[PDB]
């Protein structure tokens, strides 16, 4: 289970950056052939994907996935399993 | 004084279908597609083409005399998404605008158990 951008290598990243620079240059031959942009550039350049109510990330603790108990006291009707009836 | 004919609507992300059919389902009154209203392939997902197709289907039903229509909305289903398309709501509201009564509204989107 690759989780550090295995297929997207450094050479592939450099090629994608060169293609992006060629697109930003708006060359005719290339065409024929705070700020969210700053945050995206910081995420891309510093490899933020690699590990070390408008939106979810605005709320605090958006990183943690909240886990819950498998048993709760509640008003919900619970049907007994056939195994428990057989034991009884 | 009330004529019931089920109007089955296909609300996909790519296009929309309207299909006026008898209550038994054996005999179909009329059919119309999003691509029939608009020549562009990208405009098949557009709400305006779905509204035009719904208006044409409602005119055909009024010619057939269908006073009220039961509606069954059915998404892409299966392994694909279950969200109804943009044009389904617009065509349902267009059928409301046409003056036909709206009967029972149920969802017939197919869901698999797994895989």
């Amino acid at each position: 289970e690759d989780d550090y951008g295995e297929l997207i290598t450094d050479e592939v990243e450099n090629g994608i950056n060169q293609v992006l620079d060629a697109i930003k240059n708006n060359k005719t031959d290339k065409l024929l052939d705070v700020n969210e942009e700053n945050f995206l550039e910081e995420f891309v350049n510093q490899q933020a994907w690699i590990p070390k109510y408008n939106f979810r990330y605005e709320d605090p603790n958006a990183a943690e996935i909240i886990s819950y108990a498998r048993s709760q006291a509640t008003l919900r009707r619970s049907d007994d399993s056939s195994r428990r009836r057989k034991r009884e | 004084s009330q004529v019931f004919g089920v109007a089955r609507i296909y609300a996909s992300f790519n296009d929309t279908f309207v299909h006026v059919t008898d209550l038994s389902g054996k005999e179909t009154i009329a059919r119309v597609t999003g691509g029939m209203k608009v020549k562009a392939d990208r405009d098949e997902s557009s709400p305006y083409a779905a509204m035009l197709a719904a208006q044409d289907v409602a005119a055909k039903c009024k010619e057939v005399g269908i006073t009220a229509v039961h509606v069954k909305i059915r998404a892409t289903g299966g392994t694909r998404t279950k969200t109804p398309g943009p044009g389904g709501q617009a065509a349902l509201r267009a059928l409301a605008r046409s003056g036909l009564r709206i009967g029972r509204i149920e969802d017939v989107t197919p869901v698999p158990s797994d895989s």
Binding site: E1, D3, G5, L7, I8, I16, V19, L20, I23, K24, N26, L31, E36, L40, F43, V44, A48, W49, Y53, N54, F55, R56, Y57, A62, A63, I65, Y68, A69, Q72, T74, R76 | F13, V38, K39, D43, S46, P47, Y48, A49, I73, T81, K82, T83, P84, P86, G88, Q89, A90, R93, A96, R97, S98, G99, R101, I102, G103, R104, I105, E106, D107
Partner: protein
């Protein structure tokens, strides 16, 4: 290859097909309500229960704006939305079904209430059936969030959609194109294709969409294969 396709001169390019008209009580020319009452029922997990206990009246108030009855029964553990006689909009019951599904899938109510708008649309993606192993499932679910939520924010910047990853479901609220893109990202992430692989492709697609000349041509030559 649209073979045997007839022309459509009645279509106008000046008309905005993406525009959505509002609805009113006098919009329907029938003048009569729905013949049969239509209801939609969903279940919710037990851990949501108490939160629903504190929000439901407010939820009712929202449905009071759209003349839709609602009921929440804890013993069945179900929430049902029903159309009323004063209801005049046929799709608002579907939007209420979307609302109760989003509320069951742990989307908070200040965010979930916006599904009643015509523009918004929701998609709930099931991720429990992709991989059977628990550790691999947890790891691939953490790939979507990443460290400190950052790539998740990038996914928001990819789609302009509210994305919430809870348990076995990913809930996405936003425009239809963003819904399809995040569906692609979530399914490919559960099939162990990394989220940044699609994030970079979406960034390149946005840069290609910036130029109309590149938008006219195929993006597959410029974009890297994945």
């Amino acid at each position: 290859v649209s073979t045997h396709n007839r022309d459509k001169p009645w279509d106008t390019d000046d008309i905005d097909k993406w525009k959505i008209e509002e609805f009113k009580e006098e919009d329907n020319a029938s003048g009569q309500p729905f013949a049969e009452e239509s209801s939609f029922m969903t279940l919710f997990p037990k851990y949501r229960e108490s939160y629903l206990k504190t929000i439901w009246n407010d939820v009712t108030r929202a449905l009071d704006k759209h003349n839709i009855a609602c009921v929440l029964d804890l013993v069945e553990g179900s929430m049902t939305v029903k159309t009323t006689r004063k209801t005049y909009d046929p799709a608002i019951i579907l939007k209420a079904r979307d609302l109760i599904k989003l509320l069951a899938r742990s989307v908070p109510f200040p965010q979930a209430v916006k599904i009643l708008q015509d523009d918004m649309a929701c998609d709930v993606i099931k991720i429990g059936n992709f991989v059977t192993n628990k550790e691999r499932f947890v790891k691939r679910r953490q790939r979507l969030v990443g460290p400190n939520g950052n790539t998740l924010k990038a996914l928001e910047l990819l789609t302009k959609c509210y994305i919430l990853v809870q348990g076995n479901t990913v809930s996405a609220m936003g425009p239809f194109k963003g819904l399809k893109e995040v569906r692609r990202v979530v399914e490919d992430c559960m099939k162990n294709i990394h989220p940044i692989y699609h994030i970079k492709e979406l960034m390149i697609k946005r840069e290609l969409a910036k130029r109309p000349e590149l938008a006219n041509e195929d993006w597959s030559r410029f974009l890297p294969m994945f």
